[PDB]
Structures are given as structure tokens and as C-alpha cells.
DNA sequence: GTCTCTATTGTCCTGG
DNA sequence: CCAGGACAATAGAGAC
């Protein structure tokens, strides 16, 4: 079972694809640095619809898998 | 040609 | 309790 996407991941999910099109040149690491930078520049109001999407997902996740404990490793 | 790393934020879990 | 990890998506770039 894979963890549900947080706000960033949801926004990033598309934006990276976006950034990769406008910049096929740039490596992915760099894409990650840029997404990071412009997330922080995104206002909370701006981020809202994404938080809201990340929640629909978290809820939906809850339905699909009731017995899910997040289990990391070491 | 086939693995591993990369770098980000947010959210959860777990060793002192 | 709390500071430091895990792992969510992602696909091309280096290593061998």
C-alpha cells in the first residue's frame, strides 16, 4: 500500500510535468529545487485547492484501505 | 541494458 | 516529547 500524496506531492505531481516541458533540459533534482522554491512563494490561499485535493485523496485512501498502518523501515 | 540516486514538502512513526 | 528519519511521484542521468 503506498502512502497518500500530501499537498506538495499533488501540486508537484503536475507542475513537475509542466516544468519538464518548459525545461526538457533541466535534470529532475533541479526540477525538485524549483518546485520547492515556488511552493514557498505560493501563498496559503494559493495552496488551498491543493490541500483540499490532498484531503479528498486522504479520505478516499481511508475507504480503499481501512486496516492500513503506515509502516516504514530501517 | 538493468538497478540506484536524486532532490523536494508534508505527515507519520519511532529511537534516545 | 521531540529531533531526525521514511516515503509519497517523478523519469533521466551516472555507474558498473
From Swiss-Prot:
<feature type="DNA-binding region" description="HMG box">
    <location>
        <begin position="1"/>
        <end position="69"/>
    </location>
</feature>
<comment type="function">
    <text>Acts as a transcription regulator that binds target promoter DNA and bends the DNA. Binds to the sequences 5'-AACAAT-'3 or 5'-AACAAAG-3'. Modulates transcriptional regulation via WNT3A. Inhibits Wnt signaling. Promotes degradation of activated CTNNB1. Plays a key role in the regulation of embryonic development. Required for normal development of the definitive gut endoderm. Required for normal looping of the embryonic heart tube. Plays an important role in embryonic and postnatal vascular development, including development of arteries.</text>
</comment>
<comment type="subunit">
    <text>Interacts with CTNNB1, LEF1 and TCF4.</text>
</comment>
<protein>
    <recommendedName>
        <fullName>Transcription factor SOX-17</fullName>
    </recommendedName>
</protein>
Amino acid at each position: 500500500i503506498r502512502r497518500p500524496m500530501n499537498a506538495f506531492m499533488v501540486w508537484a505531481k503536475d507542475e513537475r510535468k509542466r516544468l519538464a516541458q518548459q525545461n526538457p533540459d533541466l535534470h529532475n533534482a533541479e526540477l525538485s529545487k524549483m518546485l520547492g522554491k515556488s511552493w514557498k512563494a505560493l501563498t496559503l490561499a494559493e495552496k488551498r485547492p491543493f490541500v483540499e485535493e490532498a484531503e479528498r485523496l486522504r479520505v478516499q485512501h481511508m475507504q480503499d484501505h481501512p486496516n492500513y498502518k503506515y509502516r516504514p523501515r530501517r
